[PDB]
Design a protein around this ligand. Structure first.
Ligand SMILES: CCCCCCCCCCCCCCCC(=O)O
Ligand SMILES: *C(=O)CCCCCCCCCCCCC
Ligand SMILES: *C(=O)CCCCCCCCCCCCC
Lengths: 61, 281, 179, 254, 61, 254
């Protein structure tokens, strides 16, 4: 029941290394920190607009 | 190849001796011109008649990794068991390669260096002499804290800074195995620079040399234990191992003795050792 | 006096101000220079030791609707020193903002650096140059209008921005525990 | 979307904005471009510094006043000190370029006044003293505005700058035949003329030849009333376009 | 997700032994030293020549 | 045809000839080229002046004498006054370039002597006064040769230029690890090293950083006999290659 995942390596000069995970305990709280999710959505803070603001257009018209 | 993927090599053996016969010809493998900037790729078979030897020798330990990846001491630091009042109750080290002579000469054989690092630290304690040296002192825990360039310095053995809400720290009890960490390639530039023939200021001034580039932050050390009646002194030895190494631009090794950990200064030494006569046995 | 007040946020502009006049100037050390230092971007920067990316300073005119003006918004990269004159500023990366119905103009500051990353802390090697503001023409107004008015400046990080080497901030401390 | 009054021009590390323009005049219908292999004569490779040369240089701005007669600037000479354009012009016998000329002038609904903004090719000016000859220092102050005169006279070898004859023996009201716009304070706050390389020969020396002159002449005088902002400047910002240089040697003047 | 690799043994009298690797940590920096890459290219230092210098020929002609 | 002793190098409006060369060293096997979109960091468009910058600049030539210990020059700084390369370096925060280095030295069948010609990357030199720090004026005279000393001492914040330790605490006989050639007066009259941009970061400031140092050190002393031409100079001519510049502002120093 082992999980294989990808290690944080770095941009190589013009790669994929893996690591292994086995969860030892019966409680998900006991698991490692969720450090590899680089997901984001600034939209809700940077643009909470009802009417979509198109950059090349004037903001007011 | 991927220097971080350790378990992925390349076996390259040394060159075999091909058998040479006698010759009488117009081709001259050992007559050349040094001026060119070229090194002669001559093999003994161009000058002698050689036999056939199979060299299964490999250039193993001379690999940059096998050469640099042996854990060396870079510095040691000292601190007593004490109160806020005692300045000596804690200590710090600004991180630098240039403090010791041995690892510094090894790294400096290359201009530019890119690697990950394994830091091991041997913290050792001793009883101070005192009327109270008789004392039941309990097991001492230690704190090593990394403060990256910009964070709060600890002013005392006992201030908010030691909380480490964001700085990396290691807490280590005595008697256990030496504390060990791995460090990524921490630099802002594409490779670490052992040398910088340049200035800290655009106006050709301020700080000259490598110092300007190698801003690594610092390690703060303290005891976590409250003081026992008699003082106990601890000294921490910081060990560095360059692993996952890449190296650029080879240099001549340092001839002259090192003087300053801050700069590349030297006083002129002889090129080699002197001998009895130009004809020697 | 003005830093513990709302004045801190409003830059004072005036009518009949002569053409090449400087509005303000400072070197771009986000997270280190008092002007940007404790803003949202500045504060985030202060939990890190390395930054990277482009910054955008959005200039908003809060003068009378009946008022007018043109300003040179400049960014000089390092090496030469701070732009002493509107001509010096002109030579560097710049926007000439004409104020009008669109209230605000944004000066987009490009990441121009030797290195992929700079220090958050002020460092001679990781110097980022100077952002300055100048009257390109002047602020002009009609008859019963106020002579002095104000502009204001917003700042944020563009989609190429990032931060590294996590650290504790100098911005908060204690002597003892709280109760 | 897109009000035609609003415009944004970007060239090199330079953007100019305007929220009250009146279109943009492309000189004689032609957009600037590089010298072609058919029309070339200097056999050496041209240096083309692109963004380093071709960017927006703001020249010393002048003040518009009710009675102020007018101004002129001479190109490429006005740019002889503007950054790396100036340097390239200094180290090369021959140079060629077109230009985006952007004149700026803002005032208010309550102000009034109207200036002609015109790019005159080969505007060869007359000596005030008809008997004598004119001279460079009275022809051009580089990036500083040379003024037109209401007065019919001037100091030794000064140009006859009497406005109604435009410094060149013709009717100023006919200057409109050259690529031009007008900043009428009611209507707009800026003018933009994109001037092509207009000359009888493929490249020329950047100092010797003033290829064209920018004249800003107030046809309707600047006016406003009772306490309504006195100071109203006119700022000229210009960007070289498709600039290329031939014949390289030492720093040049003589 | 285990990796099997070859151990450094030695030239045998006229062989292949293996070892196992499992990466335990999420960061490639944490990995063992890259000790088995005996690759080299002295050329850049021993021969930085624009024109190729053929050994059997005279260096200058 | 084609004797390999004869060579002709042309770059911009410049050609150097030699009729006694010993091949040409391409630094670390790499020919110079422009910064690529993968390796870039400064987001602005680079100016690439090509022929105007990338051409042969002859620096102030030095005299070789029997007892003369040696010379060094620092790049790009030696070129800080060489034409439009210097100007571009002056108006830009960042610059990048490789170089064709051509050292010239002719004498006669009857003269003898041998000099090492080497391009040392990051040659960070030591202070003569080990206690103190060095300073720019004792590190570089721009295009003028800084001399190596036979004497183990120097004026306040002068570099320890004692030749056998190459000004940097190492054996001068090992300098050969860096891209090098030799002008041995028997064999050749010139040396040519084509140096790539060697540095830990894609672009750098042209003043602050001396990316490499050109050292010319006589390993075998200059000699000749009874009345056979005393004066024999060494001239260094260098051409920038693939030069590009980012971050433009005003004239720069501080
Ligand atoms: C308790 C956490 C400790 C974290 C320690 C971080 C140490 C950073 C080490 C930087 C090593 C830099 C090597 C520079 C080499 C050189 O250029 O000479
Ligand atoms: C899936 O889990 C089976 C894969 C092989 C498991 C090897 C297990 C390693 C040793 C036991 C860990 C048990 C933790 C309770
Ligand atoms: C691939 O990784 C699965 C192969 C079998 C794995 C046995 C794992 C050994 C025990 C667990 C190590 C876990 C380290 C976090």
């Amino acid at each position: 029941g082992a999980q294989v995942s990808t290690q944080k390596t770095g941009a190589h000069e013009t790669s994929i290394i893996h690591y292994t995970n086995i969860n030892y305990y019966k409680d998900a709280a006991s698991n490692s920190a969720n450090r590899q999710d680089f997901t984001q959505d600034p939209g809700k803070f940077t643009e909470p607009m009802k009417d979509v603001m198109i950059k090349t257009l004037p903001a007011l018209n | 190849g991927d220097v971080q993927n350790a378990v992925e090599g390349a076996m390259v053996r040394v060159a075999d001796t091909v058998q040479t016969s006698a010759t009488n010809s117009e081709r001259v493998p050992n007559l050349t011109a040094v001026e060119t900037g070229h090194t002669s790729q001559a093999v003994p078979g161009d000058t002698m008649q050689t036999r056939h030897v199979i060299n299964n020798h490999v250039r193993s330990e001379s690999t940059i990794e096998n050469f640099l990846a042996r854990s060396a001491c870079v510095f040691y630091l000292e601190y007593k068991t004490g109160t806020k009042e005692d300045s000596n109750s804690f200590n710090n080290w600004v991180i630098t390669t240039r403090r010791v002579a041995q690892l510094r000469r090894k790294l400096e054989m290359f201009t530019y260096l890119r690697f990950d690092m394994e830091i091991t630290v041997v913290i050792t304690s001793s009883q101070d002499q005192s009327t109270s040296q008789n004392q039941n002192a309990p097991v001492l825990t230690h704190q090593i804290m990394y403060v990256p360039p910009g964070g709060p310095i600890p002013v005392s053995v006992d201030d908010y800074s030691w909380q480490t809400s964001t700085n990396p720290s290691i807490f280590w009890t005595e008697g256990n195995a030496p504390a060990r960490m791995s460090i990524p390639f921490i630099s802002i530039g594409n490779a670490y620079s052992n040398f910088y023939d340049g200035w800290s200021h655009f106006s050709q001034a301020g700080v000259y040399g490598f110092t300007t580039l190698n801003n690594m932050g610092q390690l703060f050390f303290r005891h976590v234990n409250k003081p026992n009646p008699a003082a106990i002194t601890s000294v921490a030895r910081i060990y560095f191992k360059p692993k996952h190494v890449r190296a650029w631009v080879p240099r001549p090794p340092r001839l002259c003795p090192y003087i300053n950990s801050t700069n590349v200064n030297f006083e002129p030494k002889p090129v080699t050792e002197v001998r009895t006569n130009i004809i020697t046995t | 006096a003005k830093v513990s007040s709302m004045e801190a946020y409003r830059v004072e502009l005036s009518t009949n101000t002569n053409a090449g006049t400087q509005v303000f100037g400072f070197q771009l050390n986000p997270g280190a220079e008092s002007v940007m230092n404790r803003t949202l971007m500045g504060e985030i920067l202060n939990y890190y030791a390395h930054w990277s990316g482009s910054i955008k300073i959005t200039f908003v005119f809060c003068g009378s609707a009946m008022t007018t003006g043109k300003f040179l918004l400049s960014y000089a990269p390092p090496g030469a020193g701070a732009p002493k004159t509107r001509k010096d500023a002109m030579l560097g990366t710049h926007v000439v903002w004409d104020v009008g119905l669109q209230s605000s103009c944004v000066l987009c500051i490009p990441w121009i650096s030797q290195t992929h990353y700079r220090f958050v802390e002020k460092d001679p090697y990781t110097n980022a140059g100077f952002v300055t503001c100048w009257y390109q023409t002047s602020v002009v107004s009609p008859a019963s209008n106020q002579p002095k008015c104000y502009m204001m400046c917003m700042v944020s990080a563009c989609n190429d921005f990032s931060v590294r080497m996590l650290r504790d901030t100098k911005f908060i401390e204690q002597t003892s525990f709280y109760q | 979307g897109y009000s035609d009054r609003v415009r944004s021009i970007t060239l090199g590390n330079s953007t100019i904005t305007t929220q009250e323009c009146a279109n943009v005049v492309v000189g004689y219908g032609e957009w600037p471009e590089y010298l072609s292999d058919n029309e070339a004569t200097a056999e050496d490779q041209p240096t083309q510094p692109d963004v380093a040369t071709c960017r927006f240089y703001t020249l010393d701005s002048v003040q518009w006043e009710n009675g102020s007669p007018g101004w002129w600037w001479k190109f490429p000479d006005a740019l002889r000190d503007m950054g790396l354009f100036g340097q390239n012009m200094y180290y090369h016998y021959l140079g060629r370029a077109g230009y985006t000329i952007h004149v700026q002038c803002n005032a208010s609904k309550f102000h009034q006044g109207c200036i002609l903004v015109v790019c005159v090719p080969e505007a060869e000016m007359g000596s005030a003293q008809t008997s004598g000859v004119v001279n460079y220092e009275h022809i051009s102050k580089g990036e500083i505005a040379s003024r037109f005169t209401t007065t019919t006279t001037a100091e030794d070898h000064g140009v006859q700058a009497a406005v109604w004859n435009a410094g060149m023996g013709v009717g100023v009201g006919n200057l409109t035949i050259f690529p031009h716009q007008w900043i009428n304070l009611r209507t707009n706050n800026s003018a933009t003329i994109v001037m092509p390389y207009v000359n009888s020969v493929p490249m020329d020396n950047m100092y010797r030849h003033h290829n064209f002159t920018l004249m800003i002449i107030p046809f309707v005088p600047l006016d406003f009333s009772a306490g309504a902002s006195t100071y109203v400047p006119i700022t000229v910002t210009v960007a070289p376009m498709c600039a290329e240089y031939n014949g390289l040697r030492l720093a040049g003047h003589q």
